[PDB]
């Protein structure tokens, strides 16, 4: 399927901010190395009382419609990078766009641009979105994607780890991700359009993240899954993403049930202390955490590079523990909690440890345990590092 050409050349007047912002967002999804050179262009189709800007690269698709004073309908394809780099510098004045055969004339204020028209006849029609599996608030959706994306793998050689698994079960959604050494799992409530829906797709972490920032503040985002591709839909913006082929491990079983030890401490405090101690670590490889008697003793380094240590008070419960973690991984997790205090759950030094937001129910923990893992909206499991 290709774009259908009519009998009229596109002529339209636009608002600089609307057209420039639309071209900007639609430009972000352009391919660096186009599978087909045609894909490098942006599609402009004006109809009735609206203008559509579209981009598509056989994997990701982005389409947005904006108000437009249409003088003559039509469709045209032009270089996306030139369109974005031009629309960015256009004066804050009405944008006259007028196609005339092999050339498209973009005149704004005193500036006049003439750009060659591409082979619009060979531009693949972008995919359509499959129904509406439900609606999620934009802010919370983006936050969840943020809290999970940090765990996604970033090695293209390891595609099975680069994906974020989206699980749908009724009015609740569960996002998850892992890089084989850390696991992030978020859960949020949404408005599904069918009561007993059971779905489980895998979306590229980065693409779902960009689609996360897609959606202005205070809006909503409609999701449209199909068996396949996914459909993110934030009001006038309508984007789609092809699903990921690899399989995602069953993270449910990996979540610990109880904890031999638990530790609640302030997020900012612990983060700053970690960053200080990790300065002397070798290529940010390890931080030695020592929990004992309501006091965390952080240390790192050696006489080779330099040894740093920092003590912090902490609400600790259980037998004294000596565990070591990756500094980057630890701070990565602490940044996603978005809570004042963090709660830790340690089984053994060589087994994973839980990092979940701390609640009022952690103001006191009586007994020596083992303690039962509490239900949380977001959890960040992290695999430790072997000590000497």
């Amino acid at each position: 399927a290709t774009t259908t050409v009519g009998l009229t050349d596109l002529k339209v007047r636009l608002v600089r901010d609307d057209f420039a912002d639309a071209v900007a967002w639609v430009a972000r999804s352009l391919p660096s190395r186009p599978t087909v050179p045609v894909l490098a262009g942006v599609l402009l189709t004006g109809s009735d009382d609206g203008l559509t800007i579209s981009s598509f690269d056989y994997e990701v698709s982005a389409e947005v419609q904006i108000p437009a004073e249409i003088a003559a309908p039509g469709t045209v394809l032009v270089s996306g990078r030139l369109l974005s780099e031009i629309t960015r510098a256009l004066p804050n004045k009405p944008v006259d766009l007028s196609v005339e055969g092999t050339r498209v004339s973009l005149t704004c204020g005193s500036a006049r641009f003439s750009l060659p028209t591409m082979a619009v006849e060979d531009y693949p029609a972008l995919p359509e979105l499959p129904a509406e599996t439900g609606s999620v608030p934009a802010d919370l959706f983006a936050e969840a994607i943020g809290q999970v994306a940090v765990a996604a793998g970033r090695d293209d050689t390891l595609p099975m780890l680069t994906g974020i698994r989206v699980e749908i079960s009724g009015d609740r959604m569960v996002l998850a991700a892992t890089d084989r050494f850390r696991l992030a799992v978020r859960e949020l409530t949404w408005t599904t359009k069918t009561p007993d829906v059971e779905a489980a797709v895998l979306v590229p972490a980065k693409t779902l993240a960009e689609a996360a920032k897609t959606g202005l503040d205070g809006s909503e985002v409609q999701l449209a899954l199909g068996a396949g591709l996914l459909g993110i839909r934030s009001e006038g913006k309508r984007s789609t993403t092809r699903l990921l082929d690899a399989e995602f491990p069953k993270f449910r079983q990996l979540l610990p049930t109880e904890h031999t030890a638990m530790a609640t401490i302030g997020v900012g405090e612990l983060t700053e202390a970690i960053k200080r101690v990790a300065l002397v670590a070798d290529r940010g490889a390890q931080v030695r955490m020592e929990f004992a008697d309501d006091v965390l003793h952080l240390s790192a380094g050696a006489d080779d590079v330099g040894r740093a240590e920092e003590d912090l008070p902490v609400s600790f419960s259980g037998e004294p523990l000596t565990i070591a973690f990756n500094p980057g991984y630890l701070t990565d997790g602490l940044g996603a909690l978005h809570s004042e205090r963090v709660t830790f759950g340690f089984t053994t030094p060589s087994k994973p440890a839980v990092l979940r937001p701390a609640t009022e129910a952690d103001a006191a923990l009586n007994g020596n345990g083992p303690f039962p893992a509490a239900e949380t909206d977001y959890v960040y499991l992290l695999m430790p590092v072997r000590l000497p």
Partner: peptide, 6 residues
């Protein structure tokens, strides 16, 4: 560094 799986 240990692993969660594999």
């Amino acid at each position: 560094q240990f692993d969660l799986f594999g």
